[PDB]
Write a protein that holds these residues in place. Structure first.
Motif, PDB file in Angstrom:
ATOM      1  N   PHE A  97     -32.687  69.317  78.062  1.00 22.36           N
ATOM      2  CA  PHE A  97     -32.460  69.776  76.488  1.00 22.36           C
ATOM      3  C   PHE A  97     -31.055  69.297  76.262  1.00 22.36           C
ATOM      4  CE2 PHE A  97     -34.336  72.610  73.134  1.00 22.36           C
ATOM      5  CZ  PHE A  97     -34.334  71.459  72.532  1.00 22.36           C
ATOM      6  N   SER A  98     -30.004  69.807  76.969  1.00 25.71           N
ATOM      7  CA  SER A  98     -28.704  69.565  76.751  1.00 25.71           C
ATOM      8  C   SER A  98     -28.421  68.107  76.689  1.00 25.71           C
ATOM      9  CB  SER A  98     -27.840  70.213  77.658  1.00 25.71           C
ATOM     10  OG  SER A  98     -26.481  69.762  77.940  1.00 25.71           O
ATOM     11  N   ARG A  99     -28.783  67.263  77.695  1.00 28.33           N
ATOM     12  CA  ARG A  99     -28.723  65.702  77.625  1.00 28.33           C
ATOM     13  C   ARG A  99     -29.185  65.159  76.639  1.00 28.33           C
ATOM     14  NH1 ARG A  99     -30.177  64.926  83.786  1.00 28.33           N
ATOM     15  NH2 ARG A  99     -31.183  66.722  83.540  1.00 28.33           N
ATOM     16  N   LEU A 100     -30.496  65.685  76.307  1.00 27.31           N
ATOM     17  CA  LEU A 100     -31.341  64.964  75.052  1.00 27.31           C
ATOM     18  C   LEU A 100     -30.446  65.177  73.694  1.00 27.31           C
ATOM     19  CD1 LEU A 100     -33.783  63.232  74.686  1.00 27.31           C
ATOM     20  CD2 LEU A 100     -35.051  65.354  74.951  1.00 27.31           C
ATOM     21  N   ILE A 101     -29.984  66.434  73.554  1.00 25.08           N
ATOM     22  CA  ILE A 101     -29.014  66.673  72.353  1.00 25.08           C
ATOM     23  C   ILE A 101     -27.589  66.260  72.391  1.00 25.08           C
ATOM     24  CG2 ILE A 101     -30.716  68.555  71.324  1.00 25.08           C
ATOM     25  CD1 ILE A 101     -28.977  70.507  72.453  1.00 25.08           C
ATOM     26  N   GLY A 102     -27.293  66.260  73.618  1.00 24.97           N
ATOM     27  CA  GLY A 102     -25.858  65.992  73.950  1.00 24.97           C
ATOM     28  C   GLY A 102     -24.685  66.911  73.702  1.00 24.97           C
ATOM     29  N   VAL A 103     -25.172  68.176  73.552  1.00 31.06           N
ATOM     30  CA  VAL A 103     -24.223  69.296  73.666  1.00 31.06           C
ATOM     31  C   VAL A 103     -24.018  69.998  75.253  1.00 31.06           C
ATOM     32  CG1 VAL A 103     -23.875  71.796  72.302  1.00 31.06           C
ATOM     33  CG2 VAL A 103     -25.576  69.970  71.441  1.00 31.06           C
ATOM     34  N   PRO A 104     -22.971  70.237  75.426  1.00 32.75           N
ATOM     35  CA  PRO A 104     -22.731  70.695  76.822  1.00 32.75           C
ATOM     36  C   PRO A 104     -23.535  72.010  77.235  1.00 32.75           C
ATOM     37  CG  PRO A 104     -20.787  69.992  75.764  1.00 32.75           C
ATOM     38  CD  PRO A 104     -21.760  70.034  74.712  1.00 32.75           C
ATOM     39  N   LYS A 105     -24.275  71.848  78.383  1.00 36.98           N
ATOM     40  CA  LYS A 105     -24.984  73.206  78.694  1.00 36.98           C
ATOM     41  C   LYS A 105     -24.443  74.398  78.347  1.00 36.98           C
ATOM     42  CE  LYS A 105     -26.345  73.256  83.126  1.00 36.98           C
ATOM     43  NZ  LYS A 105     -26.952  73.223  84.225  1.00 36.98           N
ATOM     44  N   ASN A 106     -23.052  74.567  78.301  1.00 36.48           N
ATOM     45  CA  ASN A 106     -22.452  75.928  78.321  1.00 36.48           C
ATOM     46  C   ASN A 106     -23.017  76.621  76.887  1.00 36.48           C
ATOM     47  OD1 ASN A 106     -21.016  78.108  79.330  1.00 36.48           O
ATOM     48  ND2 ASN A 106     -19.045  77.263  79.211  1.00 36.48           N
ATOM     49  N   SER A 107     -22.790  75.487  75.879  1.00 32.36           N
ATOM     50  CA  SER A 107     -23.315  75.789  74.379  1.00 32.36           C
ATOM     51  C   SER A 107     -24.834  76.000  74.459  1.00 32.36           C
ATOM     52  CB  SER A 107     -22.815  75.015  73.294  1.00 32.36           C
ATOM     53  OG  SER A 107     -22.701  75.241  72.090  1.00 32.36           O
ATOM     54  N   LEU A 108     -25.474  75.698  75.347  1.00 35.02           N
ATOM     55  CA  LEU A 108     -26.991  75.707  75.295  1.00 35.02           C
ATOM     56  C   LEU A 108     -27.294  77.107  75.847  1.00 35.02           C
ATOM     57  CD1 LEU A 108     -29.237  74.054  74.550  1.00 35.02           C
ATOM     58  CD2 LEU A 108     -27.232  72.782  74.612  1.00 35.02           C
ATOM     59  N   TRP A 109     -26.418  77.537  76.872  1.00 32.60           N
ATOM     60  CA  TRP A 109     -26.709  79.128  77.516  1.00 32.60           C
ATOM     61  C   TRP A 109     -26.136  80.024  76.460  1.00 32.60           C
ATOM     62  CZ3 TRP A 109     -25.122  83.601  78.970  1.00 32.60           C
ATOM     63  CH2 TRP A 109     -25.673  84.190  80.154  1.00 32.60           C
ATOM     64  N   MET A 110     -25.330  79.843  75.888  1.00 28.84           N
ATOM     65  CA  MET A 110     -24.593  80.681  74.758  1.00 28.84           C
ATOM     66  C   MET A 110     -25.425  80.644  73.591  1.00 28.84           C
ATOM     67  SD  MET A 110     -21.804  81.792  75.807  1.00 28.84           S
ATOM     68  CE  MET A 110     -20.932  83.158  75.527  1.00 28.84           C
ATOM     69  N   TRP A 111     -26.499  79.659  73.296  1.00 31.81           N
ATOM     70  CA  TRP A 111     -27.399  79.916  72.077  1.00 31.81           C
ATOM     71  C   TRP A 111     -28.522  80.493  72.507  1.00 31.81           C
ATOM     72  CZ3 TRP A 111     -26.940  73.945  70.789  1.00 31.81           C
ATOM     73  CH2 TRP A 111     -25.788  73.736  70.082  1.00 31.81           C
ATOM     74  N   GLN A 112     -28.990  80.282  73.792  1.00 30.75           N
ATOM     75  CA  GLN A 112     -30.247  80.723  74.496  1.00 30.75           C
ATOM     76  C   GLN A 112     -30.228  82.078  75.017  1.00 30.75           C
ATOM     77  OE1 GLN A 112     -30.869  77.556  77.478  1.00 30.75           O
ATOM     78  NE2 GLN A 112     -31.289  79.252  78.891  1.00 30.75           N
ATOM     79  N   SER A 113     -28.954  82.491  75.197  1.00 37.45           N
ATOM     80  CA  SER A 113     -28.929  84.001  76.010  1.00 37.45           C
ATOM     81  C   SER A 113     -28.307  84.955  75.603  1.00 37.45           C
ATOM     82  CB  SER A 113     -28.403  83.723  77.479  1.00 37.45           C
ATOM     83  OG  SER A 113     -29.139  82.936  78.269  1.00 37.45           O
ATOM     84  N   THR A 114     -27.021  84.599  74.653  1.00 37.03           N
ATOM     85  CA  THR A 114     -26.015  85.474  74.116  1.00 37.03           C
ATOM     86  C   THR A 114     -26.492  85.726  72.426  1.00 37.03           C
ATOM     87  OG1 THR A 114     -24.370  84.199  73.388  1.00 37.03           O
ATOM     88  CG2 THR A 114     -24.347  84.710  75.889  1.00 37.03           C
ATOM     89  N   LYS A 115     -25.889  86.371  71.753  1.00 39.66           N
ATOM     90  CA  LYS A 115     -25.980  86.527  70.357  1.00 39.66           C
ATOM     91  C   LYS A 115     -24.960  85.557  69.703  1.00 39.66           C
ATOM     92  CE  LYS A 115     -23.424  89.004  68.250  1.00 39.66           C
ATOM     93  NZ  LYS A 115     -22.335  87.808  68.440  1.00 39.66           N
ATOM     94  N   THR A 116     -24.915  84.374  70.177  1.00 41.63           N
ATOM     95  CA  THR A 116     -24.211  83.370  69.463  1.00 41.63           C
ATOM     96  C   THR A 116     -25.083  82.300  68.520  1.00 41.63           C
ATOM     97  OG1 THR A 116     -22.866  83.385  71.491  1.00 41.63           O
ATOM     98  CG2 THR A 116     -22.456  81.464  70.034  1.00 41.63           C
TER      99      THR A 116
END
Length: 51
Positions: free
Chosen positions: A15-34
């Motif tokens: 997903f991160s490679r598909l959208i280009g966003v670094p995986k750290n931001s993906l984890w922040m979106w999918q796990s925390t209240k970010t």
DNA sequence: CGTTGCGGCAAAGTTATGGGTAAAGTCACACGTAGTCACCATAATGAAATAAGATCACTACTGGGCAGTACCAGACTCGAACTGATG
């Protein structure tokens, strides 16, 4: 949780490679209240082609 | 009754007044009467002037905001690295 488990078979690297966003931001979106940025939000939506 | 004076009666005599008719007077036709200042109020402009109005210029008084400065965090994003599952 739904979209990652729908076409990404429960992975974030694809997903991160598909959208280009670094995986750290993906984890922040999918796990925390970010909240993803609006540009990022509708870029993900465009990748899903859903409003 | 003989005479004398007086008075009534009725023509007669004298003035007056409103008519008619011929005949002596009378007077305009003679280029001519209209004609001319003097008079003071009213319309009626055109000019003289307005009394206010319009604007300039200056002097002073007083509201009052903009480009710029500065901090204290909260929050999202992501280098860089750690660590576990796996074919």
């Amino acid at each position: 949780n739904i979209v990652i488990d729908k076409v990404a078979e429960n992975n974030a690297a694809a997903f991160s490679r598909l959208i280009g966003v670094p995986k750290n931001s993906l984890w922040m979106w999918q796990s925390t209240k970010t909240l993803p940025e609006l540009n990022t939000l509708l870029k993900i939506c465009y990748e899903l082609e859903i409003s």
